[PDB]
Amino acid sequence: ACDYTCGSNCYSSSDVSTAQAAGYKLHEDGETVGSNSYPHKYNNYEGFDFSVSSPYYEWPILSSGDVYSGGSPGADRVVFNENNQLAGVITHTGASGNNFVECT
Numbered sequence: 021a022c023d024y025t026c027g028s029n030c031y032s033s034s035d036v037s038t039a040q041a042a043g044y045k046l047h048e049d050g051e052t053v054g055s056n057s058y059p060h061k062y063n064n065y066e067g068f069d070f071s072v073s074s075p076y077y078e079w080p081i082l083s084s085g086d087v088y089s090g091g092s093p094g095a096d097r098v099v100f101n102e103n104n105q106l107a108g109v110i111t112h113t114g115a116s117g118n119n120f121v122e123c124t
């Protein structure tokens with residue numbers, strides 16, 4: 021079973037934990053990877069009920085389970101805050117333009 025499912029992608033809590041740890045360390049190092057510079061700030065304009073406070077940052081989580089290192093970031097993302105607290109898992113899948121929907 022999947023702890024989070026984004027579209028057709030299934031993630032376990034260990035997949036989320038692994039991806040967040042890598043995104044958080046680049047954020048502490050003031051480093052980014054990929055053409056779209058991840059991790060980068062996330063603005064909650066869609067109003068997702070996250071129980072952890074802002075600011076928020078997004079980093080790609082890959083269906084392969086590999087940690088993102090550059091190349092195509094896919095559609096899904098882990099969102100974490102300044103305190104390295106997980107806020108949610110969201111995706112561009114099934115959302116228009118560059119809007120997001122939450123993974124379930």
Ligand code: VO4
Nearest residue numbers: 056078097112118
């Ligand atoms: O870098 V994205 O916000 O377009 O997921």
Ligand SMILES: [Ca+2]
Nearest residue numbers: 031032035085
């Ligand atoms: Ca996995």
